[PDB]
Design a protein around this nucleic acid. Structure first.
Ligand SMILES: [Cl-]
Ligand SMILES: [Cl-]
Ligand SMILES: [Cl-]
Ligand SMILES: [Cl-]
Ligand SMILES: [Cl-]
Ligand SMILES: [Mg+2]
Ligand SMILES: [Mg+2]
Ligand SMILES: [Mg+2]
Ligand code: NA
Ligand code: NA
Length: 326
DNA sequence: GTCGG
DNA sequence: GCTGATGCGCA
DNA sequence: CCGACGGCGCATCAGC
């Protein structure tokens, strides 16, 4: 892809800053730069050219000049040669191990997959599941499998209560040929911004998906959000499907459009949409869009009847989910 | 790391 | 138990 | 030129 060398380099640096340096704002700056560069319709041929883009400053331009001149970046060559950095970065790939736990682990001599299995006693439940399924969670999901997964979830939900509506969001909604995981937005008429006259609405769905053995493990679970593991059924003598990450959010029914916008993403698109909203005088979350008061405080929710309504308020033209990807 | 207050 | 902060995570 | 940068759910810990 166009400018793929550069957006790789920057993505790699972003990961280093988040996972090793624990410099989350440099992570964000590198990701914003990579993002704007990726949508730039011309081959970048200098740092001075790239610098004109929003989110590319002096230091990224210097890096782009080195990479363009040489085909590499010495900064990234040193990071790659540092075994400690590589170990720390690697352990963050385990679900439940973030940058702080990876460093502690590496500080205690736990550097490899082998080391983590010998030291299961130091891992919490989430981390144990992330380890057990490590290879499986590194794989993407063909859209073909996502369709089978959607079919099971929509079916089992319908059985619990035909009034539930479940929408598969994330990269799948955006039209991706493969997905990292499955994200399911759930609504039910008894859960609104006004009140909750039925308990256990998310719990009912989760336990039904457990009863039929689709959901296999739980990483975390509250009233509105479920994070776990699932698996498609396979045929006799066939290799098993990989276990897959699944997220389910229950959103108030009257807030469905803010919900589905948030959950459709991508993440960078959401952050750029919310930042733009901020500079247009609004604040957006998965529940509401509200006008910003002069005290800084947000006002009451604005009426929303579609995703496009949210785009209209901030004076963006409507982007279809397919155009919300990086 | 970038950009704006 | 709380509030507030941190860690890990979602898009 | 120093300090803000989307926004929040769940799990856990600190200091009450
Ligand atoms: Cl930072
Ligand atoms: Cl390189
Ligand atoms: Cl559970
Ligand atoms: Cl809404
Ligand atoms: Cl809200
Ligand atoms: Mg996803
Ligand atoms: Mg997900
Ligand atoms: Mg993600
Ligand atoms: Na710039
Ligand atoms: Na991780």
């Amino acid at each position: 892809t166009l400018n793929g060398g550069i957006t790789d380099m920057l993505t790699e640096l972003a990961n280093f800053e988040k996972n090793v340096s624990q410099a989350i704002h440099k992570y964000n700056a590198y990701r914003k730069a990579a993002s704007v560069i990726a949508k730039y319709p011309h081959k970048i041929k200098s740092g001075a050219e790239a610098k004109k883009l929003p989110g590319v400053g002096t230091k990224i331009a210097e890096k782009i000049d080195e990479f363009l001149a040489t085909g590499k970046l010495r900064k990234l060559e040193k990071i790659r040669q540092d075994d400690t950095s590589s170990s720390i970065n690697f352990l963050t790939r385990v679900s439940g191990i973030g940058p702080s736990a990876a460093r502690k682990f590496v500080d205690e001599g736990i550097k490899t997959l082998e080391d983590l299995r010998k030291n299961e006693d130091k891992l919490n439940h989430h981390q144990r599941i992330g380890l057990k399924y490590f290879g499986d969670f590194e794989k993407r999901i063909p859209r073909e499998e996502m369709l089978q997964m959607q079919d099971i979830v929509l079916n089992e939900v319908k059985k619990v209560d035909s009034e539930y509506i479940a929408t598969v969001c994330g990269s799948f909604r955006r039209g991706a040929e493969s997905s990292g995981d499955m994200d399911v937005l759930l609504t039910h008429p008894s859960f609104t911004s006004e009140s909750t006259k039925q308990p256990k609405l998310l719990h009912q769905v989760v336990e039904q998906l457990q009863k039929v053995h689709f959901i296999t493990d739980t990483l975390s679970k509250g009233e509105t959000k479920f994070m776990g593991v699932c698996q498609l059924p396979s045929k006799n003598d066939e290799k098993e499907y990989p276990h897959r990450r699944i997220d389910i959010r229950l959103i108030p029914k009257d807030q469905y459009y803010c919900g589905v916008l948030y959950f459709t993403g991508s993440d960078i698109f959401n952050k750029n949409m919310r930042a733009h909203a901020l500079e247009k005088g609004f604040t957006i979350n998965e529940y509401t869009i509200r006008p910003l008061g002069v005290t800084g405080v947000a006002g009451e929710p604005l009426p929303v009847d579609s995703e496009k309504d949210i785009f209209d308020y901030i004076q963006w033209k409507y982007r279809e989910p397919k155009d919300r990807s990086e």
